[PDB]
Design a protein around this nucleic acid. Structure first.
Ligand SMILES: [Mg+2]
Ligand SMILES: [Mg+2]
Ligand SMILES: [Mg+2]
Ligand SMILES: [Mg+2]
Ligand SMILES: [Mg+2]
Ligand SMILES: [Mg+2]
Ligand SMILES: [Mg+2]
Lengths: 48, 82, 119, 178, 136
RNA sequence: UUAUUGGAGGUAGAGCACUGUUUGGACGAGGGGCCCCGGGUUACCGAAUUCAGACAAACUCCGAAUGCCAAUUAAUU
RNA sequence: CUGGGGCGGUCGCCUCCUAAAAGGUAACGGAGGCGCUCAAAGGUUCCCUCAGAAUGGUUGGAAAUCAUUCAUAGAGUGUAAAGGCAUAAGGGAGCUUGACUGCGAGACCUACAAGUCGAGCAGGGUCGAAAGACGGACUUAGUGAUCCGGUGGUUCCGCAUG
RNA sequence: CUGGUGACUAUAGCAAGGAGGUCACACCUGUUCCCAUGCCGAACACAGAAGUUAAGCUCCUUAGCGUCGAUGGUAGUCGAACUUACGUUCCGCUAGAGUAGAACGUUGCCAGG
RNA sequence: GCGGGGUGGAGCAGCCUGGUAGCUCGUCGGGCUCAUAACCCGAAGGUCGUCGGUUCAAAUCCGGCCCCCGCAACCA
């Protein structure tokens, strides 16, 4: 994967996780369900 | 003084200190690494876990025993002392 | 000439793979299910000692009756659970025997759960 | 079940008498029929494979399974995983109906028909027939078909030997070149 | 000139020369053969020289079996160079011979002819040799 | 330190089961120079197969001596 | 650095052989790779087994797709090599995001700084009937200290006090 | 004896010949339903029992192959003495290959006969 | 010692970045001219130095080998 990605919780905006994606393979901002510590629940996290 | 060519070699990686870390018939505390290896030259046995790098580790305190596991395989196991 | 596969041998290979991660302790004995064309057999087994604690089968006279094989399977599952209760067995690990968890095999399992064996 | 009825009664009697089979189970039977169409042209044009699929679907009455290349070959301009063929497996009633039609209608319709080859046996009592065109089959219409294409029909028999297989096909009334 | 068509490794460690012959210590294809009583490298050139000599005397009436093959490549540094800066280029191909090894086998001739032919071959080779026959 | 016992590991030697290297025998899957869709036979036989014989730091069906790690272990230090 | 120096070559990391059957071990010794890649090529559940050869068959040829038999792995395993893997670590499908958060008994390696493995506990989850598995990838390269600066968060500080 | 399910390095396997079927296990008969096919009730699943030991399977015989395998000897080697010899000698250890031989399994638990 | 190059008969591209052989001249058949040249029209011709490797696939990438070219070959 060619680029570094930061995933931010949709609900609180917290940059909980960092990840990698291939920009050509995945041009759109990637989204995935991740545990949010502040919320203490799994929430959708989207690439900034 | 004749001019000279060069070798295209001269490289090697650091040695990884693989092999047995504990003897057969020796007491070990839980978590003790028993064997370091690439792949499974020795399989995880009783009360022995296999790490992501295929390291064999005791999952309990006990005595280490290296055992045969079929015609061409071997395993390591830990047994709790009486 | 086309070869016909032996279904029991195929399921046995599948059983061995299941058996790698599944074993019966005295505390949690294995419930093995063997399914034939006509009958279903259940044994509660302790793998460490290599001993069978209890058994129930459609071929057994008490269980034997005129019923659909799934109906019989439910009866076998209820029977094995009651026998296990007598021996004080409440916790068991279900061994599917390499058969798919559906129909007859499931019915036996469900029946044992309903009887009180905990999966 | 005309072909099946013959097999159950007439064919079984002939085979068991001929080979002195101890049990009825010993008597040979046709396990399956597989129709294979190879479409390397599909590599050049996807539509060619699509047209073939339709034809096979009409001929067999069941949707074909598209076959994808096992490996890449440069000469054929083939890439692994590319769809280059279609296959159908006919079993049970569908198999007998297709086979009876083939001998009764499709094989007669074959142009300059001089009978089927007797040497087309794998040596394990399995027979493969190659059709030059799919126009021979009754369902196919000449106007509908853009390109005439051949097909491979594989008849798999439980018979151990070709000779036993030959008898089974002859009893079914399959024409042979002799 | 006998040589391997290809090798995985062109630059190899030089062979151990101490010890006795592992195999080929018996005449198996011919009536008579030449047995090495000393250890030395045998080059492809030496084999050819010995072969040509023995065939000439035999007059090609008999058959010659060459038991030894020069598998191992050996390197030599370019002339007038200092030490280091890598191993040299392949110079030749050699067979390690230890005492007992049968170098050549001859058949289809009288013993007298064979003894002379092997004698002529022996003088072309570095090792000391003894005339040998099949043993039963 | 030694004795006793258990274990890890692949070297020496050896071997050719694998990967390569290699000698001499036979022998052919299948047609060409050859004799008829109507048969044959004095290359190649390259595929392959087989018998015997050799080779290897980066080959191994094998496999020591030693050395190494241990033991509610004994003797001596 | 250098079998004087220059010139040529080289500098970190990974794999093998040299390495003398634990580990470790050098030369400008013999061979190769790395400065990634993958949103599945990760997790889980279920299911599945190769390469090759022979024979039969149309477009079709040594070789395409089909069928049977033989075939113990000569296949495959993202990518070097080695060690592993056919109870798969290889292939297919469904559902998913554990490519979690806080951590961590013990252990390996080790001059230091680092590096490696880790049962188990808590929180909140995914797949599974369930047992259970899951803190990326068959394992081992794919990386760079501190200072300084940027960006986001923060029940921390705020030079008389706000 | 048979079956289910475990243990063991194939002495347990492979191949070849033979034998066997109230029950059991299959093959088998169908696809209405649960469920299934990247097509196919082939398989899987389910509902069954007309037919059949044909095959699988189980049992018996065998040593062709695979497997196991000495004793003796040999190679190698720790130590020692002697030497510089592509070494020698002594002592302990001691292969590989091959040979005789072994071997067509041995067993635990549970339910039936 | 270290680089570069070897492609229809000639000279010169294509390689970097694998799938694609180009341009000019020459050659060949026809035409124009009394004839030739020039000119016009149509056409053919390179296994990419050679053996290997990697790859589904090699002019192209990688390694030898042969040939050719350039540069270096110093301090005593
Ligand atoms: Mg290393
Ligand atoms: Mg050796
Ligand atoms: Mg070592
Ligand atoms: Mg050592
Ligand atoms: Mg600074
Ligand atoms: Mg203030
Ligand atoms: Mg002119």
């Amino acid at each position: 994967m060619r680029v570094n990605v930061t995933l931010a919780c949709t609900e609180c905006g917290d940059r909980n996780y960092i990840t990698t994606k291939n920009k050509r393979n995945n041009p759109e901002r990637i989204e995935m369900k991740k545990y949010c510590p502040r919320l203490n629940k799994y929430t959708l996290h989207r690439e900034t | 003084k004749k001019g000279v060519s060069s070798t295209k070699n001269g490289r090697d990686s650091e040695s990884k200190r693989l092999g047995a870390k504990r003897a057969d018939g020796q007491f070990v505390t839980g978590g003790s690494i028993l064997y370091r290896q690439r792949g499974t030259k020795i399989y995880p046995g009783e009360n022995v876990g296999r790490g992501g790098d295929d390291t064999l580790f005791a999952k309990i305190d006990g005595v280490v025993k290296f055992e045969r596991k079929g015609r061409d395989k071997k395993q390591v196991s830990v047994y709790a002392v009486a | 000439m086309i070869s016909k596969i032996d279904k029991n041998k195929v399921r046995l290979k599948r059983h061995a793979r299941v058996r790698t991660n599944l074993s019966g302790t005295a505390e949690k004995p294995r419930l093995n299910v063997y399914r034939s064309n006509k009958h279903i057999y259940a044994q509660i087994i302790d793998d460490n000692k290599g001993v069978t604690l209890a058994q129930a089968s459609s071929k057994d006279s008490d269980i034997a009756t005129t019923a659909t094989k799934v109906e019989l399977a439910t009866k076998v599952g209820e029977a094995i659970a009651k026998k296990a209760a007598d021996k004080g067995i409440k916790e068991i690990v279900f061994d599917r025997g390499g058969y798919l968890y559906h129909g007859r095999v499931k019915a036996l399992a469900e029946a044992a759960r309903e009887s009180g064996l905990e999966f | 079940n005309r072909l099946k009825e013959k097999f159950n009664t007439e064919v079984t009697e002939n085979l068991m008498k001929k080979f002195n089979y101890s049990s009825v189970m010993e008597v040979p039977k046709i396990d399956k029929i597989v129709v294979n169409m190879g479409v390397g042209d599909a590599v050049q044009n996807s539509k060619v494979l699509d047209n073939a699929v339709e034809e096979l679907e009409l001929i067999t009455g069941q949707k074909p399974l598209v076959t994808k290349a096992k490996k890449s070959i440069a000469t054929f301009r083939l890439r692994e995983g590319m769809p280059i063929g279609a296959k159908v497996t006919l079993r049970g009633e569908r198999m007998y109906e297709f086979l009876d039609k083939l001998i009764s209608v499709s094989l007669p319709r074959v142009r300059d028909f001089q009978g089927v080859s007797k040497k087309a046996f794998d040596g394990r009592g399995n027979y493969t027939l190659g059709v030059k065109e799919q126009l021979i089959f009754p369902e196919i219409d000449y106007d509908k078909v853009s390109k005439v294409r051949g097909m491979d029909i594989v008849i798999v028999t439980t018979a151990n030997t070709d000779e036993e297989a030959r008898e089974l096909l002859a009893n079914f009334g399959m024409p042979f070149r002799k | 000139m006998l040589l391997p068509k290809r090798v995985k490794y062109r630059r190899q460690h030089r062979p151990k020369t101490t010890g006795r012959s592992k195999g080929g210590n018996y005449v198996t294809f011919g009536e008579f053969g030449l047995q090495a009583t000393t250890t030395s490298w045998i080059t492809s050139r030496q084999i050819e020289s010995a072969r040509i000599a023995m065939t000439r005397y035999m007059k090609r009436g008999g058959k010659v079996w060459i038991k030894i093959f020069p598998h191992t490549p050996y390197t030599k540094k370019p002339l007038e160079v200092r030490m280091g800066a890598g191993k040299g280029a392949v110079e030749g191909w050699i067979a390690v011979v230890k005492p007992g090894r049968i170098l050549f086998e001859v058949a289809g001739v009288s013993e007298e002819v064979a003894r002379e032919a092997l004698r002529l071959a022996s003088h072309k080779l570095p090792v000391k040799t003894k005339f040998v026959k099949r043993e039963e």
